[PDB]
Amino acid sequence: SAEQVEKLRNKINNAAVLVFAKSFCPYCKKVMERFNNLKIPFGYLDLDLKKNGSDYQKMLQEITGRTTVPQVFFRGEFIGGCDDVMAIDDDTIVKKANEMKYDYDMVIIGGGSGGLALAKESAKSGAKVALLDFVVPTPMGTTWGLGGTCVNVGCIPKKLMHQAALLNHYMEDAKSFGWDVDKGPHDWVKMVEGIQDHIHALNFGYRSSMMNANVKYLNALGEIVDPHTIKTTNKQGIVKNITTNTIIVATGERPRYPPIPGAKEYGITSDDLFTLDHNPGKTLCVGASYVSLECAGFLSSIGCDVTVMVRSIFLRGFDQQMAGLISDYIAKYGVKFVRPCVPTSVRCLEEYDPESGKLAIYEVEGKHEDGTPFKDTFNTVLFAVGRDPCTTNIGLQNVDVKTTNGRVVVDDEERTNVPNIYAIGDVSNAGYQLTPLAIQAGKNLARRLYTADDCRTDYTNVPTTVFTPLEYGCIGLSEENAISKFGEDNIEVFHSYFQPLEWTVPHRPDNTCYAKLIINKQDDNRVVGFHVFGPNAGEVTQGYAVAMHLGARKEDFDRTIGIHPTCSETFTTLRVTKSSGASA
Ligand SMILES: Cc1cc2nc3c(=O)[nH]c(=O)nc-3n(C[C@H](O)[C@H](O)[C@H](O)COP(=O)(O)OP(=O)(O)OC[C@H]3O[C@@H](n4cnc5c(N)ncnc54)[C@H](O)[C@@H]3O)c2cc1C
Ligand SMILES: [Au+]
């Protein structure tokens, strides 16, 4: 109440056409059917499916002065109950439900994972919405279609290359299983065509979706001029201001290059790798982030001579034991590491020649800490250091939207310091930079803006997985972080090394695959961390995220019967602790 009433007023006004409803109520039917008949796009909320739905009933009477539902609004103007909507003509209602002020209800800057999702979901609940997306090309020249980082230049192409890499070992395994296989060379270009086919079908599918939902896809660069107007600047060079009630920033990030001679003019990044014409050849990856080690990982298994140059430690921010095991493995099966090193120069000794099939060579220099010098020669330098949020150049200075470390600061409804400017997915200072989280952020905001719902998105207990040659999934805290957060005295860690059955016949190292649970003994042996290293870590791990949201404890895993034979059953049977010292 009081504070709550005003929160609902604010949603009603900033919505479009909006019907408060109930399942078992007859009249709400009538109104909605009429709105469908006149192509009037709206967005309902069934108070019956809420359980704080009572508050709403009473809150709405504060606002409108009417007792029952249905209760209709046209962008903040109360239109009335059922008998009120019917007294307005077939022509003049359609007119009334379009009175706008602004060109759009929502303009979305960026058509990535989050933008696209926010966009489709808001149009479903009646908003007139514009989606800006423009891919500023890479220093090298590269560009892609609609869909964002994941679709074009991340998750999708990344996991496909990985699968190509995983098959390499699967074929070596198949001889143990009785198959006579020789297997031949790997043609890089044939892979990249079928990858780039799939990305093109997704480019198309997303463009199609926006079109079928009445989202105006504008292929142009957005920039804020003030809280209700953005400046669009298109492929040609044109300019064109458009107005809007709500602005959503959703511009993602881009690869960071370090500040050294040759970085931009001779290196490449993830943006370029997935669309490369030729074999990358003898390749060097600079950085120990997830992008670097995944890329390194699948290039090596594809045949390439990979070297990874690490500044200090691997996967800063992930559990350092597990990072250890990721690197160790990667290293056992071919990836050469150079550590600690940062590169200092990139210089071009030779040219690439399509006339007539033969790769460029670059001399890279580095300081080997103490330091001896580093100097070696590669065909590809791949910078996989970090990624920078896309917040310079969008006019954030004009509205003074607050930032930190470059990320747009936001509250728990994804809103900035200026109350009609929201930000979602990677640019925000909420959460891990992941696609499903960009998506859900946006799906839920759509429902708050244009159905007046209170559903917020939960940024705790987020699962993640790194697709290294052997995969690492994790939820919750690292061991170090749980330790330092809850105290050494209050955490027990359960662990076990094990072997998938699928590896016993092919004689691949035993006790490499590994599982640990982090336990906060003080809070009823709550699971506060989950870590798995092995094949299909992503699958193994997804389901335990739900159990964690429901507050799983150790006894909750042990009462669960396992599935056999599976890698994931090991979590139902864990006994050895780290404090015991017993071998795992
Ligand atoms: C190599 C790699 C692998 C990854 N793998 C995974 C994975 O396996 N799983 C996972 O969950 N996540 C993964 N991620 C993260 C995931 O890709 C991102 O979390 C997700 O793409 C973010 O979506 P977004 O909508 O916030 O940003 P983006 O998808 O990047 O959306 C931003 C879009 O806006 C455009 N844009 C920027 N500025 C403007 C402007 N001013 N006007 C108009 N348009 C603009 C950009 O060109 C881009 O198309 C990976 C990322 C990388 C780099
Ligand atoms: Au396993």
Side-chain angles (χ1 to χ4, degrees), residues 158 270 273 283-299 306-310 314-315 330 335 337 382-386 466 468-469:
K158 177 272 291 283
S270 22
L273 178 67
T283 145
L284 171 69
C285 307
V286 173
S289 66
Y290 76 94
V291 170
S292 201
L293 297 177
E294 291 177 354
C295 283
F298 63 72
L299 295 186
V306 187
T307 316
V308 174
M309 195 179 289
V310 177
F314 303 100
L315 298 174
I330 272 199
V335 180
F337 291 93
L382 199 190
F383 290 104
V385 172
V466 183
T468 25

PDB file of all heavy atoms in Angstrom, residues 158 270 273 283-299 306-310 314-315 330 335 337 382-386 466 468-469:
ATOM      1  N   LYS A 158      30.533 -21.057 -31.501  1.00  0.00           N
ATOM      2  CA  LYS A 158      31.460 -21.615 -30.522  1.00  0.00           C
ATOM      3  C   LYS A 158      31.150 -23.086 -30.237  1.00  0.00           C
ATOM      4  O   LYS A 158      31.966 -23.909 -30.497  1.00  0.00           O
ATOM      5  CB  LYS A 158      31.443 -20.760 -29.266  1.00  0.00           C
ATOM      6  CG  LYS A 158      32.286 -21.238 -28.124  1.00  0.00           C
ATOM      7  CD  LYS A 158      31.521 -22.224 -27.220  1.00  0.00           C
ATOM      8  CE  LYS A 158      30.384 -21.635 -26.409  1.00  0.00           C
ATOM      9  NZ  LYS A 158      30.944 -20.908 -25.263  1.00  0.00           N
ATOM     10  N   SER A 270      37.337 -13.118 -31.340  1.00  0.00           N
ATOM     11  CA  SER A 270      36.171 -13.969 -31.537  1.00  0.00           C
ATOM     12  C   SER A 270      35.279 -13.511 -32.722  1.00  0.00           C
ATOM     13  O   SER A 270      34.837 -14.361 -33.567  1.00  0.00           O
ATOM     14  CB  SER A 270      35.363 -14.048 -30.241  1.00  0.00           C
ATOM     15  OG  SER A 270      35.619 -12.958 -29.392  1.00  0.00           O
ATOM     16  N   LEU A 273      36.905 -14.971 -35.836  1.00  0.00           N
ATOM     17  CA  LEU A 273      37.293 -16.412 -35.902  1.00  0.00           C
ATOM     18  C   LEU A 273      36.256 -17.333 -36.530  1.00  0.00           C
ATOM     19  O   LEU A 273      36.600 -18.355 -37.156  1.00  0.00           O
ATOM     20  CB  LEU A 273      37.659 -16.936 -34.507  1.00  0.00           C
ATOM     21  CG  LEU A 273      38.058 -18.391 -34.261  1.00  0.00           C
ATOM     22  CD1 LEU A 273      39.367 -18.756 -34.890  1.00  0.00           C
ATOM     23  CD2 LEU A 273      38.158 -18.606 -32.773  1.00  0.00           C
ATOM     24  N   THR A 283      48.541 -20.930 -34.352  1.00  0.00           N
ATOM     25  CA  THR A 283      47.836 -19.829 -33.680  1.00  0.00           C
ATOM     26  C   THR A 283      48.268 -19.616 -32.194  1.00  0.00           C
ATOM     27  O   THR A 283      48.739 -20.540 -31.521  1.00  0.00           O
ATOM     28  CB  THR A 283      46.300 -19.865 -33.980  1.00  0.00           C
ATOM     29  OG1 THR A 283      45.544 -19.433 -32.849  1.00  0.00           O
ATOM     30  CG2 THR A 283      45.815 -21.194 -34.416  1.00  0.00           C
ATOM     31  N   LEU A 284      48.194 -18.347 -31.776  1.00  0.00           N
ATOM     32  CA  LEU A 284      48.533 -17.881 -30.437  1.00  0.00           C
ATOM     33  C   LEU A 284      47.279 -17.214 -29.915  1.00  0.00           C
ATOM     34  O   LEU A 284      46.743 -16.352 -30.588  1.00  0.00           O
ATOM     35  CB  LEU A 284      49.651 -16.812 -30.466  1.00  0.00           C
ATOM     36  CG  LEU A 284      49.932 -16.091 -29.123  1.00  0.00           C
ATOM     37  CD1 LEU A 284      50.557 -17.058 -28.138  1.00  0.00           C
ATOM     38  CD2 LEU A 284      50.815 -14.873 -29.265  1.00  0.00           C
ATOM     39  N   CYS A 285      46.829 -17.590 -28.722  1.00  0.00           N
ATOM     40  CA  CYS A 285      45.711 -16.922 -28.091  1.00  0.00           C
ATOM     41  C   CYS A 285      46.228 -16.104 -26.961  1.00  0.00           C
ATOM     42  O   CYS A 285      46.883 -16.621 -26.119  1.00  0.00           O
ATOM     43  CB  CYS A 285      44.737 -17.932 -27.528  1.00  0.00           C
ATOM     44  SG  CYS A 285      44.227 -19.123 -28.759  1.00  0.00           S
ATOM     45  N   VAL A 286      45.928 -14.831 -26.911  1.00  0.00           N
ATOM     46  CA  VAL A 286      46.342 -14.045 -25.780  1.00  0.00           C
ATOM     47  C   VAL A 286      45.184 -13.949 -24.816  1.00  0.00           C
ATOM     48  O   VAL A 286      44.127 -13.447 -25.200  1.00  0.00           O
ATOM     49  CB  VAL A 286      46.758 -12.660 -26.223  1.00  0.00           C
ATOM     50  CG1 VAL A 286      47.023 -11.764 -25.025  1.00  0.00           C
ATOM     51  CG2 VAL A 286      47.999 -12.771 -27.092  1.00  0.00           C
ATOM     52  N   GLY A 287      45.397 -14.430 -23.583  1.00  0.00           N
ATOM     53  CA  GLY A 287      44.418 -14.350 -22.499  1.00  0.00           C
ATOM     54  C   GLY A 287      44.033 -15.683 -21.930  1.00  0.00           C
ATOM     55  O   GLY A 287      44.134 -16.681 -22.599  1.00  0.00           O
ATOM     56  N   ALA A 288      43.595 -15.687 -20.677  1.00  0.00           N
ATOM     57  CA  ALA A 288      43.131 -16.906 -19.999  1.00  0.00           C
ATOM     58  C   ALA A 288      41.648 -16.891 -19.603  1.00  0.00           C
ATOM     59  O   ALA A 288      41.217 -17.547 -18.677  1.00  0.00           O
ATOM     60  CB  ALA A 288      43.980 -17.137 -18.774  1.00  0.00           C
ATOM     61  N   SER A 289      40.854 -16.137 -20.312  1.00  0.00           N
ATOM     62  CA  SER A 289      39.443 -16.021 -19.989  1.00  0.00           C
ATOM     63  C   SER A 289      38.736 -17.283 -20.529  1.00  0.00           C
ATOM     64  O   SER A 289      39.411 -18.209 -21.023  1.00  0.00           O
ATOM     65  CB  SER A 289      38.905 -14.752 -20.638  1.00  0.00           C
ATOM     66  OG  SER A 289      38.958 -14.887 -22.037  1.00  0.00           O
ATOM     67  N   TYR A 290      37.403 -17.343 -20.438  1.00  0.00           N
ATOM     68  CA  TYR A 290      36.723 -18.527 -20.938  1.00  0.00           C
ATOM     69  C   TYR A 290      36.811 -18.516 -22.454  1.00  0.00           C
ATOM     70  O   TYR A 290      36.965 -19.549 -23.059  1.00  0.00           O
ATOM     71  CB  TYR A 290      35.287 -18.685 -20.390  1.00  0.00           C
ATOM     72  CG  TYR A 290      34.258 -17.797 -20.985  1.00  0.00           C
ATOM     73  CD1 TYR A 290      33.484 -18.230 -22.036  1.00  0.00           C
ATOM     74  CD2 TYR A 290      34.049 -16.513 -20.492  1.00  0.00           C
ATOM     75  CE1 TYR A 290      32.550 -17.402 -22.614  1.00  0.00           C
ATOM     76  CE2 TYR A 290      33.138 -15.667 -21.073  1.00  0.00           C
ATOM     77  CZ  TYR A 290      32.368 -16.124 -22.128  1.00  0.00           C
ATOM     78  OH  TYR A 290      31.378 -15.317 -22.699  1.00  0.00           O
ATOM     79  N   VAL A 291      36.790 -17.349 -23.080  1.00  0.00           N
ATOM     80  CA  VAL A 291      36.745 -17.306 -24.537  1.00  0.00           C
ATOM     81  C   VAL A 291      38.037 -17.842 -25.093  1.00  0.00           C
ATOM     82  O   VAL A 291      38.044 -18.656 -26.053  1.00  0.00           O
ATOM     83  CB  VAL A 291      36.394 -15.886 -25.061  1.00  0.00           C
ATOM     84  CG1 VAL A 291      36.577 -15.738 -26.565  1.00  0.00           C
ATOM     85  CG2 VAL A 291      34.946 -15.609 -24.683  1.00  0.00           C
ATOM     86  N   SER A 292      39.121 -17.420 -24.472  1.00  0.00           N
ATOM     87  CA  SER A 292      40.437 -17.843 -24.921  1.00  0.00           C
ATOM     88  C   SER A 292      40.629 -19.364 -24.878  1.00  0.00           C
ATOM     89  O   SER A 292      41.054 -19.969 -25.856  1.00  0.00           O
ATOM     90  CB  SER A 292      41.504 -17.174 -24.080  1.00  0.00           C
ATOM     91  OG  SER A 292      42.700 -17.208 -24.805  1.00  0.00           O
ATOM     92  N   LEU A 293      40.292 -19.958 -23.737  1.00  0.00           N
ATOM     93  CA  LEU A 293      40.532 -21.356 -23.483  1.00  0.00           C
ATOM     94  C   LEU A 293      39.584 -22.248 -24.210  1.00  0.00           C
ATOM     95  O   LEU A 293      39.981 -23.288 -24.635  1.00  0.00           O
ATOM     96  CB  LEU A 293      40.408 -21.662 -22.004  1.00  0.00           C
ATOM     97  CG  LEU A 293      41.388 -20.993 -21.052  1.00  0.00           C
ATOM     98  CD1 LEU A 293      41.030 -21.396 -19.641  1.00  0.00           C
ATOM     99  CD2 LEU A 293      42.810 -21.390 -21.363  1.00  0.00           C
ATOM    100  N   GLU A 294      38.320 -21.889 -24.338  1.00  0.00           N
ATOM    101  CA  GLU A 294      37.451 -22.597 -25.288  1.00  0.00           C
ATOM    102  C   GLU A 294      38.014 -22.555 -26.730  1.00  0.00           C
ATOM    103  O   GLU A 294      38.089 -23.566 -27.397  1.00  0.00           O
ATOM    104  CB  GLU A 294      36.060 -22.015 -25.284  1.00  0.00           C
ATOM    105  CG  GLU A 294      35.212 -22.221 -24.055  1.00  0.00           C
ATOM    106  CD  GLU A 294      33.834 -21.523 -24.153  1.00  0.00           C
ATOM    107  OE1 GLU A 294      33.554 -20.749 -25.177  1.00  0.00           O
ATOM    108  OE2 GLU A 294      33.029 -21.716 -23.170  1.00  0.00           O
ATOM    109  N   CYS A 295      38.440 -21.389 -27.189  1.00  0.00           N
ATOM    110  CA  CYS A 295      38.872 -21.272 -28.555  1.00  0.00           C
ATOM    111  C   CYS A 295      40.101 -22.092 -28.722  1.00  0.00           C
ATOM    112  O   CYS A 295      40.173 -22.947 -29.588  1.00  0.00           O
ATOM    113  CB  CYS A 295      39.146 -19.830 -28.949  1.00  0.00           C
ATOM    114  SG  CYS A 295      37.644 -18.889 -29.273  1.00  0.00           S
ATOM    115  N   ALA A 296      41.063 -21.856 -27.854  1.00  0.00           N
ATOM    116  CA  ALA A 296      42.250 -22.681 -27.821  1.00  0.00           C
ATOM    117  C   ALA A 296      41.908 -24.146 -27.851  1.00  0.00           C
ATOM    118  O   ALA A 296      42.478 -24.910 -28.615  1.00  0.00           O
ATOM    119  CB  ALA A 296      43.053 -22.371 -26.594  1.00  0.00           C
ATOM    120  N   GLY A 297      40.950 -24.513 -27.017  1.00  0.00           N
ATOM    121  CA  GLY A 297      40.535 -25.888 -26.836  1.00  0.00           C
ATOM    122  C   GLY A 297      40.135 -26.500 -28.134  1.00  0.00           C
ATOM    123  O   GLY A 297      40.746 -27.454 -28.543  1.00  0.00           O
ATOM    124  N   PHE A 298      39.148 -25.932 -28.812  1.00  0.00           N
ATOM    125  CA  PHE A 298      38.680 -26.522 -30.078  1.00  0.00           C
ATOM    126  C   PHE A 298      39.606 -26.286 -31.288  1.00  0.00           C
ATOM    127  O   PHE A 298      39.597 -27.081 -32.209  1.00  0.00           O
ATOM    128  CB  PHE A 298      37.200 -26.168 -30.404  1.00  0.00           C
ATOM    129  CG  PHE A 298      36.924 -24.722 -30.616  1.00  0.00           C
ATOM    130  CD1 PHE A 298      37.349 -24.073 -31.762  1.00  0.00           C
ATOM    131  CD2 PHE A 298      36.174 -24.013 -29.688  1.00  0.00           C
ATOM    132  CE1 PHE A 298      37.047 -22.709 -31.968  1.00  0.00           C
ATOM    133  CE2 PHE A 298      35.877 -22.650 -29.874  1.00  0.00           C
ATOM    134  CZ  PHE A 298      36.318 -21.999 -31.027  1.00  0.00           C
ATOM    135  N   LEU A 299      40.427 -25.250 -31.324  1.00  0.00           N
ATOM    136  CA  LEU A 299      41.406 -25.239 -32.393  1.00  0.00           C
ATOM    137  C   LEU A 299      42.421 -26.407 -32.305  1.00  0.00           C
ATOM    138  O   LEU A 299      42.665 -27.108 -33.290  1.00  0.00           O
ATOM    139  CB  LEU A 299      42.106 -23.909 -32.448  1.00  0.00           C
ATOM    140  CG  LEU A 299      41.184 -22.754 -32.803  1.00  0.00           C
ATOM    141  CD1 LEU A 299      42.079 -21.551 -32.951  1.00  0.00           C
ATOM    142  CD2 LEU A 299      40.376 -23.009 -34.055  1.00  0.00           C
ATOM    143  N   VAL A 306      48.307 -24.664 -31.371  1.00  0.00           N
ATOM    144  CA  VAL A 306      47.873 -23.622 -30.481  1.00  0.00           C
ATOM    145  C   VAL A 306      48.861 -23.422 -29.370  1.00  0.00           C
ATOM    146  O   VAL A 306      49.424 -24.377 -28.848  1.00  0.00           O
ATOM    147  CB  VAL A 306      46.530 -23.972 -29.855  1.00  0.00           C
ATOM    148  CG1 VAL A 306      46.003 -22.796 -29.051  1.00  0.00           C
ATOM    149  CG2 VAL A 306      45.531 -24.341 -30.946  1.00  0.00           C
ATOM    150  N   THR A 307      49.056 -22.164 -29.032  1.00  0.00           N
ATOM    151  CA  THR A 307      49.858 -21.717 -27.918  1.00  0.00           C
ATOM    152  C   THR A 307      48.972 -20.674 -27.247  1.00  0.00           C
ATOM    153  O   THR A 307      48.317 -19.872 -27.941  1.00  0.00           O
ATOM    154  CB  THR A 307      51.174 -21.052 -28.404  1.00  0.00           C
ATOM    155  OG1 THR A 307      51.793 -21.836 -29.466  1.00  0.00           O
ATOM    156  CG2 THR A 307      52.098 -20.855 -27.257  1.00  0.00           C
ATOM    157  N   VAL A 308      48.917 -20.676 -25.920  1.00  0.00           N
ATOM    158  CA  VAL A 308      48.123 -19.701 -25.168  1.00  0.00           C
ATOM    159  C   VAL A 308      49.037 -18.880 -24.269  1.00  0.00           C
ATOM    160  O   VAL A 308      49.805 -19.417 -23.508  1.00  0.00           O
ATOM    161  CB  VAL A 308      47.033 -20.398 -24.370  1.00  0.00           C
ATOM    162  CG1 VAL A 308      46.300 -19.420 -23.491  1.00  0.00           C
ATOM    163  CG2 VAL A 308      46.044 -21.038 -25.316  1.00  0.00           C
ATOM    164  N   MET A 309      48.947 -17.567 -24.360  1.00  0.00           N
ATOM    165  CA  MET A 309      49.768 -16.701 -23.562  1.00  0.00           C
ATOM    166  C   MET A 309      48.977 -16.068 -22.414  1.00  0.00           C
ATOM    167  O   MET A 309      48.156 -15.195 -22.618  1.00  0.00           O
ATOM    168  CB  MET A 309      50.363 -15.652 -24.467  1.00  0.00           C
ATOM    169  CG  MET A 309      51.505 -14.906 -23.844  1.00  0.00           C
ATOM    170  SD  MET A 309      52.228 -13.669 -24.913  1.00  0.00           S
ATOM    171  CE  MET A 309      53.033 -14.755 -26.106  1.00  0.00           C
ATOM    172  N   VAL A 310      49.292 -16.476 -21.196  1.00  0.00           N
ATOM    173  CA  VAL A 310      48.529 -16.118 -19.995  1.00  0.00           C
ATOM    174  C   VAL A 310      49.223 -15.029 -19.166  1.00  0.00           C
ATOM    175  O   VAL A 310      50.400 -15.224 -18.819  1.00  0.00           O
ATOM    176  CB  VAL A 310      48.389 -17.384 -19.116  1.00  0.00           C
ATOM    177  CG1 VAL A 310      47.668 -17.094 -17.819  1.00  0.00           C
ATOM    178  CG2 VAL A 310      47.655 -18.444 -19.889  1.00  0.00           C
ATOM    179  N   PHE A 314      44.785 -18.649 -14.733  1.00  0.00           N
ATOM    180  CA  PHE A 314      43.640 -19.036 -15.553  1.00  0.00           C
ATOM    181  C   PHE A 314      42.259 -18.730 -14.944  1.00  0.00           C
ATOM    182  O   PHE A 314      42.064 -18.879 -13.727  1.00  0.00           O
ATOM    183  CB  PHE A 314      43.632 -20.548 -15.765  1.00  0.00           C
ATOM    184  CG  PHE A 314      44.865 -21.062 -16.371  1.00  0.00           C
ATOM    185  CD1 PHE A 314      45.825 -21.644 -15.608  1.00  0.00           C
ATOM    186  CD2 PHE A 314      45.073 -20.927 -17.723  1.00  0.00           C
ATOM    187  CE1 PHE A 314      46.986 -22.075 -16.188  1.00  0.00           C
ATOM    188  CE2 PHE A 314      46.244 -21.369 -18.302  1.00  0.00           C
ATOM    189  CZ  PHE A 314      47.194 -21.930 -17.544  1.00  0.00           C
ATOM    190  N   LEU A 315      41.312 -18.366 -15.821  1.00  0.00           N
ATOM    191  CA  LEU A 315      39.936 -18.126 -15.481  1.00  0.00           C
ATOM    192  C   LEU A 315      39.751 -17.357 -14.200  1.00  0.00           C
ATOM    193  O   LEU A 315      39.056 -17.803 -13.336  1.00  0.00           O
ATOM    194  CB  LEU A 315      39.216 -19.459 -15.389  1.00  0.00           C
ATOM    195  CG  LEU A 315      39.154 -20.296 -16.668  1.00  0.00           C
ATOM    196  CD1 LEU A 315      38.552 -21.656 -16.401  1.00  0.00           C
ATOM    197  CD2 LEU A 315      38.336 -19.568 -17.712  1.00  0.00           C
ATOM    198  N   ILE A 330      43.657 -29.632 -21.070  1.00  0.00           N
ATOM    199  CA  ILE A 330      44.055 -28.807 -22.174  1.00  0.00           C
ATOM    200  C   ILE A 330      45.603 -29.020 -22.452  1.00  0.00           C
ATOM    201  O   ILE A 330      46.009 -29.380 -23.538  1.00  0.00           O
ATOM    202  CB  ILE A 330      43.652 -27.327 -21.809  1.00  0.00           C
ATOM    203  CG1 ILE A 330      42.188 -26.824 -22.200  1.00  0.00           C
ATOM    204  CG2 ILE A 330      44.577 -26.410 -22.491  1.00  0.00           C
ATOM    205  CD1 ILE A 330      41.990 -25.295 -22.259  1.00  0.00           C
ATOM    206  N   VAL A 335      47.766 -28.299 -25.917  1.00  0.00           N
ATOM    207  CA  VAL A 335      47.843 -26.841 -25.859  1.00  0.00           C
ATOM    208  C   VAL A 335      49.076 -26.403 -25.081  1.00  0.00           C
ATOM    209  O   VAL A 335      49.247 -26.725 -23.920  1.00  0.00           O
ATOM    210  CB  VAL A 335      46.574 -26.225 -25.241  1.00  0.00           C
ATOM    211  CG1 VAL A 335      46.637 -24.681 -25.168  1.00  0.00           C
ATOM    212  CG2 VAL A 335      45.352 -26.698 -26.000  1.00  0.00           C
ATOM    213  N   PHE A 337      51.245 -23.701 -23.148  1.00  0.00           N
ATOM    214  CA  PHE A 337      51.044 -22.480 -22.345  1.00  0.00           C
ATOM    215  C   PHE A 337      52.336 -21.736 -22.105  1.00  0.00           C
ATOM    216  O   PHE A 337      53.390 -22.323 -22.071  1.00  0.00           O
ATOM    217  CB  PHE A 337      50.405 -22.783 -21.025  1.00  0.00           C
ATOM    218  CG  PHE A 337      48.988 -23.221 -21.152  1.00  0.00           C
ATOM    219  CD1 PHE A 337      48.658 -24.579 -21.232  1.00  0.00           C
ATOM    220  CD2 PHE A 337      47.958 -22.273 -21.234  1.00  0.00           C
ATOM    221  CE1 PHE A 337      47.345 -24.975 -21.348  1.00  0.00           C
ATOM    222  CE2 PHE A 337      46.637 -22.659 -21.384  1.00  0.00           C
ATOM    223  CZ  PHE A 337      46.339 -24.005 -21.419  1.00  0.00           C
ATOM    224  N   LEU A 382      45.245 -14.313 -31.670  1.00  0.00           N
ATOM    225  CA  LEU A 382      43.829 -14.217 -31.312  1.00  0.00           C
ATOM    226  C   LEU A 382      43.770 -13.559 -29.976  1.00  0.00           C
ATOM    227  O   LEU A 382      44.222 -14.136 -29.037  1.00  0.00           O
ATOM    228  CB  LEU A 382      43.203 -15.602 -31.249  1.00  0.00           C
ATOM    229  CG  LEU A 382      41.673 -15.759 -31.324  1.00  0.00           C
ATOM    230  CD1 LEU A 382      41.269 -17.199 -30.987  1.00  0.00           C
ATOM    231  CD2 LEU A 382      40.928 -14.827 -30.391  1.00  0.00           C
ATOM    232  N   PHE A 383      43.228 -12.345 -29.886  1.00  0.00           N
ATOM    233  CA  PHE A 383      43.166 -11.624 -28.620  1.00  0.00           C
ATOM    234  C   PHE A 383      41.860 -11.986 -27.952  1.00  0.00           C
ATOM    235  O   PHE A 383      40.766 -11.858 -28.539  1.00  0.00           O
ATOM    236  CB  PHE A 383      43.337 -10.115 -28.817  1.00  0.00           C
ATOM    237  CG  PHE A 383      44.713  -9.713 -29.218  1.00  0.00           C
ATOM    238  CD1 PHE A 383      44.997  -9.368 -30.485  1.00  0.00           C
ATOM    239  CD2 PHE A 383      45.736  -9.702 -28.296  1.00  0.00           C
ATOM    240  CE1 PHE A 383      46.291  -9.017 -30.849  1.00  0.00           C
ATOM    241  CE2 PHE A 383      47.041  -9.382 -28.630  1.00  0.00           C
ATOM    242  CZ  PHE A 383      47.317  -9.020 -29.915  1.00  0.00           C
ATOM    243  N   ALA A 384      41.982 -12.527 -26.757  1.00  0.00           N
ATOM    244  CA  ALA A 384      40.829 -13.001 -26.023  1.00  0.00           C
ATOM    245  C   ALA A 384      41.058 -12.650 -24.579  1.00  0.00           C
ATOM    246  O   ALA A 384      41.063 -13.480 -23.709  1.00  0.00           O
ATOM    247  CB  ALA A 384      40.642 -14.473 -26.236  1.00  0.00           C
ATOM    248  N   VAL A 385      41.246 -11.353 -24.380  1.00  0.00           N
ATOM    249  CA  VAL A 385      41.560 -10.737 -23.127  1.00  0.00           C
ATOM    250  C   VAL A 385      40.316 -10.376 -22.335  1.00  0.00           C
ATOM    251  O   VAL A 385      40.205 -10.733 -21.179  1.00  0.00           O
ATOM    252  CB  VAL A 385      42.306  -9.442 -23.371  1.00  0.00           C
ATOM    253  CG1 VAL A 385      42.458  -8.682 -22.042  1.00  0.00           C
ATOM    254  CG2 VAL A 385      43.632  -9.765 -24.029  1.00  0.00           C
ATOM    255  N   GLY A 386      39.405  -9.635 -22.911  1.00  0.00           N
ATOM    256  CA  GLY A 386      38.268  -9.203 -22.169  1.00  0.00           C
ATOM    257  C   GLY A 386      37.256  -8.695 -23.124  1.00  0.00           C
ATOM    258  O   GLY A 386      37.451  -8.775 -24.318  1.00  0.00           O
ATOM    259  N   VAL A 466      31.697 -23.606 -18.954  1.00  0.00           N
ATOM    260  CA  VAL A 466      32.795 -23.370 -19.877  1.00  0.00           C
ATOM    261  C   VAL A 466      33.045 -24.589 -20.771  1.00  0.00           C
ATOM    262  O   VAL A 466      33.420 -25.643 -20.278  1.00  0.00           O
ATOM    263  CB  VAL A 466      34.092 -23.074 -19.089  1.00  0.00           C
ATOM    264  CG1 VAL A 466      35.270 -22.753 -20.025  1.00  0.00           C
ATOM    265  CG2 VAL A 466      33.843 -21.921 -18.130  1.00  0.00           C
ATOM    266  N   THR A 468      35.365 -26.090 -22.468  1.00  0.00           N
ATOM    267  CA  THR A 468      36.732 -26.545 -22.756  1.00  0.00           C
ATOM    268  C   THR A 468      36.732 -28.006 -23.243  1.00  0.00           C
ATOM    269  O   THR A 468      35.708 -28.619 -23.247  1.00  0.00           O
ATOM    270  CB  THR A 468      37.613 -26.289 -21.521  1.00  0.00           C
ATOM    271  OG1 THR A 468      36.808 -26.244 -20.338  1.00  0.00           O
ATOM    272  CG2 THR A 468      38.242 -24.926 -21.649  1.00  0.00           C
ATOM    273  N   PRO A 469      37.860 -28.553 -23.730  1.00  0.00           N
ATOM    274  CA  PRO A 469      37.758 -29.880 -24.357  1.00  0.00           C
ATOM    275  C   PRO A 469      37.071 -30.938 -23.491  1.00  0.00           C
ATOM    276  O   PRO A 469      36.286 -31.781 -24.007  1.00  0.00           O
ATOM    277  CB  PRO A 469      39.200 -30.217 -24.609  1.00  0.00           C
ATOM    278  CG  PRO A 469      39.744 -28.899 -24.992  1.00  0.00           C
ATOM    279  CD  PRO A 469      39.164 -27.954 -24.005  1.00  0.00           C
TER     280      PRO A 469
END
